[PDB]
Amino acid sequence: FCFNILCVGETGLGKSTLMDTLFNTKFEPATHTQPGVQLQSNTYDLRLKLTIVSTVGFGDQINKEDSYKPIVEFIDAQFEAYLQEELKIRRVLHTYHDSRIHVCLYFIAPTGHSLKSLDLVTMKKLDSKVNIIPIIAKADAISKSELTKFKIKITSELVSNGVQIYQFPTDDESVAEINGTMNAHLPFAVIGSTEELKIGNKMMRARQYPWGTVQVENEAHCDFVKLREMLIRVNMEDLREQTHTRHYELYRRCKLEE
Amino acid sequence: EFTLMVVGESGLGKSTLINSLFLTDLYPERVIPGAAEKIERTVQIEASTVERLTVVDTPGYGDAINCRDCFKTIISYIDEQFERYLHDESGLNRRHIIDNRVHCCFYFISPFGHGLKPLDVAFMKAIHNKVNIVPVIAKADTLTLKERERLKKRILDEIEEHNIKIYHLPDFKEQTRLLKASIPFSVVGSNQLIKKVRGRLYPWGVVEVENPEHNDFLKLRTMLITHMQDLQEVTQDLHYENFRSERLKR
Ligand SMILES: Nc1nc2c(ncn2[C@@H]2O[C@H](COP(=O)(O)OP(=O)(O)OP(=O)(O)O)[C@@H](O)[C@H]2O)c(=O)[nH]1
Protein backbone atom coordinates (compact mmCIF):
# COMPACT_ATOMS: atom_id res chain seq x y z
CA PHE A 1 0.00 0.00 0.00
CA CYS A 2 1.32 3.42 -1.08
CA PHE A 3 0.57 6.65 0.80
CA ASN A 4 2.48 9.89 0.22
CA ILE A 5 2.34 12.82 2.65
CA LEU A 6 3.48 16.33 1.75
CA CYS A 7 4.51 18.72 4.53
CA VAL A 8 4.56 22.41 3.59
CA GLY A 9 5.64 24.85 6.28
CA GLU A 10 8.07 27.59 7.12
CA THR A 11 11.53 26.42 8.17
CA GLY A 12 11.64 25.09 11.73
CA LEU A 13 7.85 24.92 12.21
CA GLY A 14 8.08 21.29 13.37
CA LYS A 15 7.52 19.24 10.20
CA SER A 16 10.06 16.50 10.98
CA THR A 17 9.01 16.41 14.64
CA LEU A 18 5.31 15.94 13.81
CA MET A 19 5.99 13.03 11.44
CA ASP A 20 8.10 11.28 14.09
CA THR A 21 5.21 11.84 16.51
CA LEU A 22 2.61 10.26 14.20
CA PHE A 23 4.45 6.95 13.69
CA ASN A 24 6.70 6.65 16.80
CA THR A 25 9.92 6.37 14.82
CA LYS A 26 12.88 8.52 13.83
CA PHE A 27 13.11 9.52 10.17
CA GLU A 28 18.15 16.84 9.36
CA PRO A 29 17.02 20.44 9.90
CA ALA A 30 17.37 22.84 7.00
CA THR A 31 19.13 26.19 7.03
CA HIS A 32 17.51 29.57 6.48
CA THR A 33 19.96 30.46 3.68
CA GLN A 34 18.41 28.40 0.87
CA PRO A 35 18.10 30.60 -2.25
CA GLY A 36 14.94 28.79 -3.36
CA VAL A 37 12.28 26.32 -2.30
CA GLN A 38 13.19 22.65 -2.78
CA LEU A 39 11.63 19.35 -1.73
CA GLN A 40 13.07 16.28 0.01
CA SER A 41 11.42 12.89 -0.48
CA ASN A 42 12.06 9.73 1.54
CA THR A 43 10.19 6.42 1.32
CA TYR A 44 9.84 3.98 4.23
CA ASP A 45 8.60 0.38 4.47
CA LEU A 46 6.16 -0.07 7.35
CA ARG A 47 2.12 -3.53 4.57
CA LEU A 48 2.48 0.23 4.04
CA LYS A 49 4.96 2.03 1.77
CA LEU A 50 5.07 5.52 3.28
CA THR A 51 6.73 8.44 1.49
CA ILE A 52 7.33 11.77 3.25
CA VAL A 53 7.98 14.91 1.19
CA SER A 54 9.03 18.07 3.02
CA THR A 55 9.65 21.62 1.79
CA VAL A 56 13.17 23.02 2.14
CA GLY A 57 13.72 26.76 2.50
CA PHE A 58 10.02 27.65 2.31
CA GLY A 59 9.49 31.20 3.55
CA ASP A 60 13.13 32.09 4.21
CA GLN A 61 13.85 34.20 1.11
CA ILE A 62 13.27 37.94 1.25
CA ASN A 63 11.35 37.65 -2.03
CA LYS A 64 8.71 34.91 -1.75
CA GLU A 65 6.77 35.29 -5.01
CA ASP A 66 8.12 32.01 -6.47
CA SER A 67 7.52 29.82 -3.40
CA TYR A 68 4.49 27.91 -4.72
CA LYS A 69 6.12 27.11 -8.08
CA PRO A 70 8.50 24.30 -6.98
CA ILE A 71 5.72 22.57 -5.03
CA VAL A 72 3.31 22.66 -7.98
CA GLU A 73 6.16 21.48 -10.22
CA PHE A 74 6.71 18.41 -8.02
CA ILE A 75 3.01 17.56 -7.75
CA ASP A 76 2.66 17.78 -11.54
CA ALA A 77 5.74 15.57 -11.94
CA GLN A 78 3.92 12.87 -9.97
CA PHE A 79 0.72 13.45 -11.95
CA GLU A 80 2.76 13.16 -15.15
CA ALA A 81 4.61 9.97 -14.19
CA TYR A 82 1.28 8.30 -13.36
CA LEU A 83 -0.15 9.46 -16.69
CA GLN A 84 2.89 7.93 -18.41
CA GLU A 85 1.94 4.64 -16.74
CA GLU A 86 -1.62 4.64 -18.11
CA LEU A 87 -0.27 5.32 -21.62
CA LYS A 88 2.16 2.41 -21.75
CA ILE A 89 1.04 -0.36 -24.10
CA ARG A 90 2.40 -3.20 -21.94
CA ARG A 91 1.92 -1.39 -18.64
CA VAL A 92 2.45 -2.64 -15.08
CA LEU A 93 -0.22 -0.95 -12.96
CA HIS A 94 -0.34 -3.83 -10.47
CA THR A 95 3.36 -3.40 -9.60
CA TYR A 96 3.69 0.38 -10.03
CA HIS A 97 4.48 2.45 -6.93
CA ASP A 98 2.01 5.34 -6.82
CA SER A 99 4.06 8.47 -6.06
CA ARG A 100 1.22 11.02 -6.29
CA ILE A 101 0.77 13.20 -3.21
CA HIS A 102 -2.33 11.93 -1.40
CA VAL A 103 -2.44 14.56 1.36
CA CYS A 104 -0.84 17.93 2.07
CA LEU A 105 -0.50 19.09 5.67
CA TYR A 106 -0.03 22.86 5.47
CA PHE A 107 1.72 24.16 8.59
CA ILE A 108 0.43 27.55 9.78
CA ALA A 109 2.61 29.63 12.08
CA PRO A 110 0.83 30.22 15.41
CA THR A 111 0.70 34.00 14.97
CA GLY A 112 -2.69 34.34 16.66
CA HIS A 113 -4.01 36.69 13.96
CA SER A 114 -5.10 34.84 10.83
CA LEU A 115 -3.24 33.76 7.69
CA LYS A 116 -0.01 35.17 6.35
CA SER A 117 0.00 36.28 2.73
CA LEU A 118 2.34 33.38 1.94
CA ASP A 119 -0.22 30.97 3.43
CA LEU A 120 -3.08 32.37 1.34
CA VAL A 121 -1.23 32.34 -1.99
CA THR A 122 0.41 28.92 -1.65
CA MET A 123 -2.77 27.20 -0.45
CA LYS A 124 -4.85 28.91 -3.16
CA LYS A 125 -2.61 27.52 -5.92
CA LEU A 126 -2.56 24.09 -4.25
CA ASP A 127 -6.38 24.11 -4.22
CA SER A 128 -6.96 21.84 -7.22
CA LYS A 129 -3.64 19.98 -6.95
CA VAL A 130 -3.73 18.16 -3.59
CA ASN A 131 -5.98 17.38 -0.63
CA ILE A 132 -5.10 20.22 1.75
CA ILE A 133 -5.41 19.78 5.51
CA PRO A 134 -4.63 23.05 7.33
CA ILE A 135 -3.01 22.69 10.75
CA ILE A 136 -1.82 25.22 13.31
CA ALA A 137 1.82 24.30 13.85
CA LYS A 138 3.33 24.44 17.36
CA ALA A 139 -0.10 24.96 18.90
CA ASP A 140 1.42 25.27 22.41
CA ALA A 141 2.04 28.93 21.47
CA ILE A 142 -1.70 29.70 21.69
CA SER A 143 -3.82 29.79 24.83
CA LYS A 144 -7.26 28.21 24.64
CA SER A 145 -8.78 31.69 24.89
CA GLU A 146 -7.04 32.62 21.63
CA LEU A 147 -7.24 29.26 19.82
CA THR A 148 -11.01 29.58 19.43
CA LYS A 149 -10.70 33.06 17.90
CA PHE A 150 -7.70 32.01 15.79
CA LYS A 151 -9.50 29.03 14.26
CA ILE A 152 -12.44 31.27 13.33
CA LYS A 153 -10.29 33.89 11.59
CA ILE A 154 -8.41 31.21 9.66
CA THR A 155 -11.62 29.53 8.46
CA SER A 156 -13.08 32.92 7.54
CA GLU A 157 -9.91 33.48 5.49
CA LEU A 158 -10.27 30.18 3.62
CA VAL A 159 -13.98 30.73 2.91
CA SER A 160 -13.69 34.36 1.80
CA ASN A 161 -10.90 33.48 -0.66
CA GLY A 162 -12.61 30.28 -1.84
CA VAL A 163 -9.80 27.99 -0.67
CA GLN A 164 -10.80 24.36 -1.32
CA ILE A 165 -9.63 22.31 1.66
CA TYR A 166 -10.07 18.59 2.15
CA GLN A 167 -13.14 17.39 4.05
CA PHE A 168 -13.34 13.97 5.67
CA PRO A 169 -16.08 11.82 4.10
CA THR A 170 -19.54 11.97 5.63
CA ASP A 171 -21.06 9.77 2.91
CA ASP A 172 -20.07 6.67 4.89
CA GLU A 173 -22.62 6.54 7.71
CA SER A 174 -20.53 4.12 9.80
CA VAL A 175 -18.04 6.87 10.71
CA ALA A 176 -19.90 10.04 9.74
CA GLU A 177 -20.27 11.52 13.23
CA ILE A 178 -16.58 11.19 14.12
CA ASN A 179 -15.65 12.64 10.73
CA GLY A 180 -18.14 15.44 11.37
CA THR A 181 -16.26 16.15 14.60
CA MET A 182 -12.88 16.26 12.87
CA ASN A 183 -14.22 18.60 10.18
CA ALA A 184 -15.51 20.90 12.93
CA HIS A 185 -12.05 21.06 14.57
CA LEU A 186 -10.20 22.16 11.42
CA PRO A 187 -7.67 23.63 11.44
CA PHE A 188 -6.09 21.08 13.78
CA ALA A 189 -4.07 22.57 16.65
CA VAL A 190 -1.20 20.07 16.62
CA ILE A 191 1.82 19.60 18.88
CA GLY A 192 4.75 17.26 18.26
CA SER A 193 7.58 15.86 20.38
CA THR A 194 10.34 13.29 19.88
CA GLU A 195 10.79 12.41 23.56
CA GLU A 196 8.51 11.03 26.24
CA LEU A 197 8.14 11.62 29.97
CA LYS A 198 6.53 9.68 32.81
CA ILE A 199 3.11 11.32 33.25
CA GLY A 200 0.94 9.32 35.62
CA ASN A 201 2.64 6.01 34.90
CA LYS A 202 2.53 5.71 31.10
CA MET A 203 5.39 7.00 28.96
CA MET A 204 4.04 9.41 26.35
CA ARG A 205 5.33 12.19 24.11
CA ALA A 206 5.59 15.46 26.01
CA ARG A 207 7.09 18.94 26.16
CA GLN A 208 8.11 20.19 29.61
CA TYR A 209 8.33 23.89 30.48
CA PRO A 210 9.23 25.44 33.86
CA TRP A 211 5.49 26.01 34.36
CA GLY A 212 4.02 22.74 33.08
CA THR A 213 4.26 19.71 30.82
CA VAL A 214 2.34 19.47 27.55
CA GLN A 215 0.75 16.08 26.86
CA VAL A 216 0.76 15.41 23.11
CA GLU A 217 -1.75 12.53 23.18
CA ASN A 218 -4.15 14.42 25.49
CA GLU A 219 -7.16 15.67 23.54
CA ALA A 220 -7.61 18.58 25.98
CA HIS A 221 -4.07 19.84 25.31
CA CYS A 222 -4.07 19.75 21.50
CA ASP A 223 -5.80 18.18 18.50
CA PHE A 224 -3.01 15.69 17.77
CA VAL A 225 -5.40 12.80 18.44
CA LYS A 226 -7.72 14.28 15.81
CA LEU A 227 -4.88 14.42 13.27
CA ARG A 228 -3.81 10.86 14.08
CA GLU A 229 -7.37 9.61 13.39
CA MET A 230 -6.77 10.40 9.68
CA LEU A 231 -4.64 7.24 9.38
CA ILE A 232 -7.71 4.99 9.68
CA ARG A 233 -8.02 2.59 6.74
CA VAL A 234 -11.22 4.30 5.57
CA ASN A 235 -10.03 7.92 5.70
CA MET A 236 -6.58 6.99 4.36
CA GLU A 237 -8.01 5.32 1.24
CA ASP A 238 -10.36 8.23 0.54
CA LEU A 239 -7.42 10.63 0.41
CA ARG A 240 -5.88 8.21 -2.07
CA GLU A 241 -9.24 8.01 -3.87
CA GLN A 242 -10.06 11.73 -3.76
CA THR A 243 -6.60 12.30 -5.28
CA HIS A 244 -7.27 9.97 -8.21
CA THR A 245 -10.88 10.93 -8.99
CA ARG A 246 -10.67 14.70 -8.38
CA HIS A 247 -7.16 16.19 -8.44
CA TYR A 248 -5.54 13.73 -10.85
CA GLU A 249 -8.65 13.80 -13.04
CA LEU A 250 -8.27 17.58 -13.26
CA TYR A 251 -4.68 17.08 -14.43
CA ARG A 252 -5.88 14.75 -17.19
CA ARG A 253 -8.53 17.21 -18.41
CA CYS A 254 -5.87 19.89 -18.86
CA LYS A 255 -3.42 17.53 -20.59
CA LEU A 256 -6.13 16.43 -23.04
CA GLU A 257 -7.63 19.84 -23.86
CA GLU A 258 -4.25 21.30 -24.91
CA GLU B 1 12.56 62.50 25.77
CA PHE B 2 13.13 58.90 24.65
CA THR B 3 12.22 57.29 21.31
CA LEU B 4 11.74 53.51 21.04
CA MET B 5 11.32 51.83 17.65
CA VAL B 6 9.58 48.45 17.33
CA VAL B 7 10.40 46.28 14.31
CA GLY B 8 9.41 42.68 13.67
CA GLU B 9 7.21 40.20 11.83
CA SER B 10 3.50 40.64 12.47
CA GLY B 11 1.98 38.43 15.15
CA LEU B 12 5.05 38.15 17.40
CA GLY B 13 3.37 39.75 20.41
CA LYS B 14 5.19 43.05 19.92
CA SER B 15 2.12 45.13 20.79
CA THR B 16 1.43 43.00 23.87
CA LEU B 17 5.00 43.37 25.14
CA ILE B 18 4.98 47.15 24.64
CA ASN B 19 1.69 47.44 26.53
CA SER B 20 3.26 45.19 29.19
CA LEU B 21 6.39 47.31 29.75
CA PHE B 22 4.41 50.26 31.15
CA LEU B 23 0.82 48.95 31.49
CA THR B 24 -0.38 51.37 28.80
CA ASP B 25 -2.78 50.27 26.06
CA LEU B 26 -1.42 52.02 22.96
CA TYR B 27 -3.40 50.07 20.32
CA PRO B 28 -7.09 50.26 21.30
CA GLU B 29 -8.43 50.70 17.75
CA ARG B 30 -5.73 48.93 15.72
CA VAL B 31 -7.15 46.64 13.02
CA ILE B 32 -5.24 43.70 11.54
CA PRO B 33 -5.70 43.35 7.76
CA GLY B 34 -6.68 40.12 6.07
CA ALA B 35 -4.24 37.80 4.37
CA ALA B 36 -5.39 39.14 1.00
CA GLU B 37 -4.43 42.71 1.96
CA LYS B 38 -0.95 41.68 3.19
CA ILE B 39 0.07 40.49 -0.30
CA GLU B 40 0.82 44.04 -1.49
CA ARG B 41 0.92 45.71 1.93
CA THR B 42 3.60 48.37 2.34
CA VAL B 43 5.49 49.36 5.47
CA GLN B 44 3.94 52.27 7.39
CA ILE B 45 5.04 54.26 10.43
CA GLU B 46 2.84 54.88 13.48
CA ALA B 47 4.12 56.91 16.44
CA SER B 48 2.44 56.79 19.85
CA THR B 49 3.38 59.26 22.59
CA VAL B 50 2.75 58.86 26.33
CA GLU B 51 4.20 60.28 29.54
CA ARG B 52 8.34 61.63 27.64
CA LEU B 53 8.16 58.39 25.64
CA THR B 54 7.49 57.87 21.92
CA VAL B 55 6.98 54.35 20.55
CA VAL B 56 7.53 54.22 16.78
CA ASP B 57 5.85 51.15 15.30
CA THR B 58 6.39 49.81 11.77
CA PRO B 59 3.23 47.91 10.78
CA GLY B 60 3.48 46.04 7.49
CA TYR B 61 7.07 44.90 8.02
CA GLY B 62 7.42 41.38 6.63
CA ASP B 63 3.74 41.03 5.72
CA ALA B 64 4.35 41.60 2.00
CA ILE B 65 5.26 38.67 -0.23
CA ASN B 66 7.91 40.72 -2.07
CA CYS B 67 9.87 43.03 0.23
CA ARG B 68 10.37 45.69 -2.43
CA ASP B 69 11.38 48.57 -0.14
CA CYS B 70 10.70 47.07 3.29
CA PHE B 71 13.70 48.74 4.93
CA LYS B 72 13.62 51.99 2.93
CA THR B 73 10.57 53.37 4.73
CA ILE B 74 12.24 52.60 8.06
CA ILE B 75 15.77 53.70 7.11
CA SER B 76 14.57 57.01 5.68
CA TYR B 77 12.59 57.77 8.85
CA ILE B 78 15.70 57.30 10.98
CA ASP B 79 17.70 59.50 8.61
CA GLU B 80 14.88 62.07 8.52
CA GLN B 81 15.02 62.49 12.30
CA PHE B 82 18.79 62.95 12.02
CA GLU B 83 18.24 65.51 9.25
CA ARG B 84 15.55 67.45 11.13
CA TYR B 85 17.78 67.65 14.21
CA LEU B 86 20.72 68.63 11.99
CA HIS B 87 18.84 71.56 10.43
CA ASP B 88 17.46 72.58 13.83
CA GLU B 89 20.92 72.44 15.40
CA SER B 90 22.19 74.66 12.57
CA GLY B 91 19.21 76.99 13.00
CA LEU B 92 18.83 79.95 15.33
CA ASN B 93 16.09 78.59 17.61
CA ARG B 94 18.12 75.86 19.31
CA ARG B 95 16.42 76.63 22.65
CA HIS B 96 13.05 75.16 21.63
CA ILE B 97 14.08 71.99 19.79
CA ILE B 98 12.40 68.57 19.76
CA ASP B 99 14.70 65.53 19.71
CA ASN B 100 12.85 62.83 17.76
CA ARG B 101 16.00 60.84 16.97
CA VAL B 102 15.41 57.11 17.43
CA HIS B 103 17.34 56.13 20.56
CA CYS B 104 16.61 52.39 20.60
CA CYS B 105 15.12 49.81 18.22
CA PHE B 106 13.64 46.58 19.56
CA TYR B 107 13.89 43.92 16.84
CA PHE B 108 11.72 40.85 17.48
CA ILE B 109 13.27 37.53 16.42
CA SER B 110 10.83 34.72 15.72
CA PRO B 111 11.08 31.71 18.08
CA PHE B 112 9.62 29.23 15.57
CA GLY B 113 12.67 28.85 13.31
CA HIS B 114 16.15 27.47 13.81
CA GLY B 115 17.83 30.89 13.97
CA LEU B 116 17.24 34.22 12.25
CA LYS B 117 15.99 34.59 8.69
CA PRO B 118 17.87 36.48 5.95
CA LEU B 119 15.34 39.28 6.47
CA ASP B 120 16.64 39.73 10.02
CA VAL B 121 20.27 39.92 8.86
CA ALA B 122 19.59 42.38 6.04
CA PHE B 123 17.56 44.71 8.26
CA MET B 124 20.02 44.76 11.16
CA LYS B 125 22.99 45.24 8.82
CA ALA B 126 21.07 48.19 7.36
CA ILE B 127 20.47 50.08 10.64
CA HIS B 128 23.16 48.86 13.06
CA ASN B 129 25.24 51.94 12.16
CA LYS B 130 22.25 54.23 12.79
CA VAL B 131 20.32 52.88 15.81
CA ASN B 132 21.12 50.98 19.00
CA ILE B 133 19.79 47.49 18.22
CA VAL B 134 18.37 45.40 21.06
CA PRO B 135 17.45 41.91 19.81
CA VAL B 136 14.58 40.16 21.58
CA ILE B 137 13.20 36.64 21.27
CA ALA B 138 9.43 36.91 20.95
CA LYS B 139 7.00 34.48 22.60
CA ALA B 140 9.54 32.83 24.89
CA ASP B 141 6.86 30.51 26.32
CA THR B 142 7.15 28.36 23.16
CA LEU B 143 10.73 27.30 23.98
CA THR B 144 11.90 24.85 26.61
CA LEU B 145 14.99 25.72 28.64
CA LYS B 146 17.10 23.53 26.34
CA GLU B 147 15.52 25.00 23.20
CA ARG B 148 15.91 28.52 24.62
CA GLU B 149 19.66 28.20 25.19
CA ARG B 150 20.16 26.62 21.75
CA LEU B 151 18.49 29.60 20.07
CA LYS B 152 20.36 32.25 22.08
CA LYS B 153 23.76 30.70 21.35
CA ARG B 154 22.89 30.36 17.66
CA ILE B 155 21.69 33.96 17.34
CA LEU B 156 24.82 35.28 19.06
CA ASP B 157 27.08 33.25 16.75
CA GLU B 158 25.21 34.42 13.64
CA ILE B 159 25.51 37.99 14.95
CA GLU B 160 29.28 37.55 15.27
CA GLU B 161 29.85 35.93 11.87
CA HIS B 162 27.69 38.60 10.19
CA ASN B 163 29.35 41.48 12.11
CA ILE B 164 26.11 42.85 13.55
CA LYS B 165 26.75 45.95 15.67
CA ILE B 166 24.05 45.49 18.28
CA TYR B 167 23.85 47.72 21.32
CA HIS B 168 26.36 46.71 23.99
CA LEU B 169 25.99 47.22 27.72
CA PRO B 170 28.87 49.02 29.48
CA ASP B 171 31.32 46.73 31.30
CA PHE B 172 25.03 46.25 41.08
CA LYS B 173 27.75 43.81 40.05
CA GLU B 174 25.29 40.91 39.98
CA GLN B 175 22.79 43.04 38.05
CA THR B 176 25.16 43.77 35.16
CA ARG B 177 26.52 40.20 35.24
CA LEU B 178 23.14 38.45 34.99
CA LEU B 179 21.77 41.04 32.55
CA LYS B 180 24.54 40.51 29.98
CA ALA B 181 24.34 36.71 30.25
CA SER B 182 20.66 36.57 29.23
CA ILE B 183 21.17 38.46 25.94
CA PRO B 184 19.32 38.05 23.67
CA PHE B 185 16.38 38.50 26.04
CA SER B 186 13.59 35.97 25.48
CA VAL B 187 10.46 37.69 26.77
CA VAL B 188 6.81 36.88 27.41
CA GLY B 189 4.14 39.56 27.45
CA SER B 190 0.51 39.54 28.55
CA ASN B 191 -2.45 41.82 29.14
CA GLN B 192 -4.36 39.11 31.03
CA LEU B 193 -4.62 38.55 34.78
CA ILE B 194 -4.77 35.02 36.18
CA LYS B 195 -4.12 33.35 42.64
CA LYS B 196 -3.94 36.53 40.54
CA VAL B 197 -0.92 37.56 38.46
CA ARG B 198 -0.12 38.81 34.96
CA GLY B 199 0.64 36.02 32.51
CA ARG B 200 -0.76 33.48 30.06
CA LEU B 201 -3.05 30.52 30.80
CA TYR B 202 -2.53 27.07 29.26
CA PRO B 203 -4.22 23.75 30.12
CA TRP B 204 -0.89 22.42 31.48
CA GLY B 205 0.29 25.42 33.50
CA VAL B 206 0.43 29.19 33.85
CA VAL B 207 3.26 31.36 32.52
CA GLU B 208 4.20 34.36 34.67
CA VAL B 209 5.44 37.49 32.92
CA GLU B 210 7.35 38.93 35.89
CA ASN B 211 8.92 35.56 36.79
CA PRO B 212 12.62 35.60 35.79
CA GLU B 213 12.68 31.78 35.75
CA HIS B 214 9.96 31.85 33.05
CA ASN B 215 11.16 34.64 30.74
CA ASP B 216 13.36 37.75 30.63
CA PHE B 217 10.66 40.43 30.89
CA LEU B 218 12.07 41.96 34.08
CA LYS B 219 15.61 41.90 32.67
CA LEU B 220 14.48 43.68 29.49
CA ARG B 221 12.52 46.24 31.51
CA THR B 222 15.38 46.73 33.99
CA MET B 223 17.93 47.07 31.17
CA LEU B 224 15.81 49.74 29.46
CA ILE B 225 15.28 51.78 32.63
CA THR B 226 18.93 51.70 33.71
CA HIS B 227 20.53 52.11 30.27
CA MET B 228 18.05 54.72 29.02
CA GLN B 229 20.53 57.54 29.63
CA ASP B 230 23.30 55.60 27.88
CA LEU B 231 21.12 54.67 24.89
CA GLN B 232 20.40 58.30 24.02
CA GLU B 233 24.04 59.16 24.76
CA VAL B 234 25.35 56.68 22.18
CA THR B 235 22.70 57.93 19.75
CA GLN B 236 23.80 61.56 20.08
CA ASP B 237 27.56 60.96 20.27
CA LEU B 238 27.94 58.05 17.82
CA HIS B 239 25.03 57.41 15.44
CA TYR B 240 24.18 61.09 14.92
CA GLU B 241 27.80 62.17 14.36
CA ASN B 242 28.36 59.35 11.86
CA PHE B 243 25.28 60.48 9.93
CA ARG B 244 26.56 64.06 10.11
CA SER B 245 29.94 63.16 8.60
CA GLU B 246 28.31 60.91 5.99
CA ARG B 247 25.82 63.68 5.16
CA LEU B 248 28.74 66.00 4.31
CA LYS B 249 29.97 63.67 1.56
CA ARG B 250 27.71 65.53 -0.89
N1 LIG C 1 6.90 24.94 20.91
C1 LIG C 1 6.99 23.87 20.13
N2 LIG C 1 8.21 23.47 19.64
C2 LIG C 1 8.31 22.38 18.84
C3 LIG C 1 7.18 21.66 18.51
N3 LIG C 1 7.55 20.64 17.71
C4 LIG C 1 8.89 20.70 17.53
N4 LIG C 1 9.37 21.78 18.22
C5 LIG C 1 10.78 22.22 18.29
O1 LIG C 1 11.10 22.89 17.08
C6 LIG C 1 12.26 22.35 16.48
C7 LIG C 1 12.04 22.24 14.97
O2 LIG C 1 11.72 20.91 14.66
P1 LIG C 1 11.72 20.34 13.15
O3 LIG C 1 10.88 19.09 13.07
O4 LIG C 1 13.14 20.09 12.72
O5 LIG C 1 11.08 21.52 12.25
P2 LIG C 1 11.03 21.46 10.64
O6 LIG C 1 9.80 22.16 10.12
O7 LIG C 1 11.05 20.03 10.18
O8 LIG C 1 12.38 22.19 10.14
P3 LIG C 1 12.92 22.02 8.63
O9 LIG C 1 12.80 20.59 8.16
O10 LIG C 1 14.37 22.43 8.56
O11 LIG C 1 12.09 22.92 7.75
C8 LIG C 1 12.48 20.98 17.11
O12 LIG C 1 13.84 20.77 17.37
C9 LIG C 1 11.72 21.03 18.41
O13 LIG C 1 12.62 21.25 19.46
C10 LIG C 1 5.94 22.05 19.00
O14 LIG C 1 4.93 21.41 18.71
N5 LIG C 1 5.85 23.16 19.81
Ligand SMILES: Nc1nc2c(ncn2[C@@H]2O[C@H](COP(=O)(O)OP(=O)(O)O)[C@@H](O)[C@H]2O)c(=O)[nH]1
Ligand atom coordinates in the same frame (compact mmCIF):
# COMPACT_ATOMS: atom_id res chain seq x y z
N1 LIG D 1 2.98 32.57 23.08
C1 LIG D 1 2.85 33.90 23.28
N2 LIG D 1 1.83 34.55 22.66
C2 LIG D 1 1.66 35.88 22.83
C3 LIG D 1 2.59 36.62 23.70
N3 LIG D 1 2.20 37.90 23.69
C4 LIG D 1 1.11 37.99 22.88
N4 LIG D 1 0.79 36.78 22.38
C5 LIG D 1 -0.33 36.49 21.46
O1 LIG D 1 -0.02 36.80 20.10
C6 LIG D 1 -1.22 37.20 19.42
C7 LIG D 1 -0.92 38.44 18.60
O2 LIG D 1 -0.02 39.23 19.35
P1 LIG D 1 0.21 40.78 18.99
O3 LIG D 1 0.55 41.56 20.23
O4 LIG D 1 -1.03 41.35 18.33
O5 LIG D 1 1.45 40.69 17.97
P2 LIG D 1 1.91 41.91 17.03
O6 LIG D 1 1.45 41.65 15.62
O7 LIG D 1 3.41 42.01 17.02
O8 LIG D 1 1.32 43.21 17.53
C8 LIG D 1 -2.25 37.52 20.49
O9 LIG D 1 -3.31 36.56 20.39
C9 LIG D 1 -1.53 37.36 21.81
O10 LIG D 1 -2.35 36.74 22.79
C10 LIG D 1 3.68 35.83 24.34
O11 LIG D 1 4.51 36.38 25.09
N5 LIG D 1 3.74 34.52 24.09
Ligand SMILES: [Mg+2]
Ligand atom coordinates in the same frame (compact mmCIF):
# COMPACT_ATOMS: atom_id res chain seq x y z
MG1 LIG E 1 12.62 18.82 9.46
